[PDB]
Design an enzyme around this catalytic site. Structure first.
Site: not given
Lengths: 319, 319
Positions: B10, B12-14, B38, B55, B144, B148
């Protein structure tokens, strides 16, 4: 508000074995579809009414069987429980969670009533151990327990978000005469009645003074119906309600047994792995929310049970 | 104790964007593997070092990449977050839960360090509103949040039962000059600084006195490293730690902005959808187990952050 046409997944487990018979008698042999992954030689269920092979992890086939009988209720019992889940944890996650999410997506699509049972196993070491509240700390260290908490959350999400009629109960140890002792965690309280009429002597795998919630199968089966059919509007909680009928140490059953079989003896060996899990678990839960919200009732105390177990195990032929 | 070779899902997340760039500088461009479903050309991550397309739900490819770079640390950021997760709750369940069991089974096989971020969104209405303890009630109404909480339980199971080194923190809302705003629930606390420097009006989608835990990106990233590398023996909790820098309300940022841009003004037109999620969350958490167990610390108060943000967003040039 009442059930007409009912699909039971996991119908050949301990609860399903006796539930499918009860609901057949009460709702019609032709309105109860019992389902399981695999047939079991001479289970009563399999040789009496409607029965369908179903792997709940196949959404498609699960949906096919919901539509084929136009069901209004799904009692989703399919799962791996404590013993098997610890040995086969990924298989337990897949069945318990993909099975459940499949059933929820079906219930979302069809406007079904959706009952999922949960467990004392959904409570951790730091869960309060005495009159355990309805809402409290749920951090279990077993894969079975994790699947039951994950499921409570998911079943409540399908209600809060999509309006699916989801509901459930946290069963304690269940005692039945139909299903034989399966050396599971709480099964000491079943085998004791067998070894009472068979010898006059029981070897406990569970330490004396260890207290646990228990319920006699008929009480539990009624819970499921009373709750499925309860008026929606008084439900504050949904997935899932603490219920219980009794707490007791091995020595307290003995005293109930001996009040009818006076020569009876209680030795103590100690399987430390099962003791461990009994020590994980609360000693007694608080059924108040259950009582306040849908009038949870129950009929058998430790005495009433002990009498009925020794009758029903003699009729079946053990002594 | 120390991270040698690091796989980031992940990335390229925040969190992802700024974490790979930081662990590159600190641990060497050739020991951090950034991974994502992606690419984006826009991302600084993609033109700076090692990047694998991954993925996370394909166990086999996840394993292939883990083995390819003989990785000792996996930082499993791959997930759908609060907002997108509500749009497509099933994609969110698949990615966040099958992604994570895949990474746990890999970490079990390769004896890796497995860090997995949680958030405040893992807390309910029931969850204590001020100084929320480490061990409390977790009954979220968001998919979400359900992911979590299922996640924390699963990660702890992998440590208790198989000794995997699973650890994480519950991220408050996070503020960044790198990752543009819009979309997410807590993003008002980034977008405002953009409108503060364009004109000097922000219209907020969050009501005038709603406290929420928040944290400046660099405190957050330093949290991950500090906790991953912390010594295991004084860890009583693992998945995942309450951490916070600051609670605050539109009111209070606004006034912090006015110290540097006095002309500033906050209109208010609230989004029901998102406002709800905020109101469903604690106002302030209790960081006190973090501090005791792995010497958690931060270093940006509300004012220090407002300074840094306003410089950095005008370097990139905005007015």
């Amino acid at each position: 508000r009442h059930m007409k046409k009912i699909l039971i997944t996991g119908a050949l487990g301990q609860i399903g074995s006796e539930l499918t018979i009860k609901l057949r008698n009460e709702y019609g042999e032709q309105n109860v579809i019992a389902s399981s992954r695999r047939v079991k030689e001479g289970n009563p269920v399999c040789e009496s009414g409607i029965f369908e092979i179903l792997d709940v992890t196949d959404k498609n086939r699960f949906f096919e069987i919901a539509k084929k009988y136009d069901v209004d209720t799904i009692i989703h019992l399919a799962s791996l429980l404590s013993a098997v889940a610890e040995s086969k944890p990924l298989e337990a996650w897949n069945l318990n969670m993909n099975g459940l999410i499949n059933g929820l997506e079906i219930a979302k699509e069809l406007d079904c009533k959706f009952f999922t049972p949960s467990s004392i196993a959904a409570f951790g070491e730091n869960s309060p151990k005495n009159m355990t509240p309805q809402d409290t700390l749920q951090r279990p260290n077993t894969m079975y327990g994790v699947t039951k908490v994950s499921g409570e959350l998911l079943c409540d999400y399908y209600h809060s978000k999509f309006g699916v009629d989801t509901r459930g109960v946290r069963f304690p140890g269940l005692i039945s005469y139909v299903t034989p002792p399966g050396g599971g965690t709480t099964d000491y309280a079943v085998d004791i009645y067998y070894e009472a009429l068979k010898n006059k002597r029981y070897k406990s795998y569970i330490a004396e003074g260890t207290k646990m919630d228990m319920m006699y199968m008929p009480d539990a089966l009624q819970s499921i119906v009373d709750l499925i059919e309860a008026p929606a509007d008084k439900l504050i909680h949904r997935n899932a309600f603490n219920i219980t009928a009794m707490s007791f140490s091995p020595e307290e059953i003995a005293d109930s047994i001996k009040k009818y079989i006076p020569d009876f003896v209680i030795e103590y060996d100690v399987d430390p792995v099962r003791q461990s899990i009994a020590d994980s678990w609360p000693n007694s839960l608080d059924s108040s929310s259950a009582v306040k919200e849908w009038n949870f009732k129950f009929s058998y105390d430790l005495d009433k049970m002990t009498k009925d177990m020794l009758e029903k195990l003699s009729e079946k032929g053990i002594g």
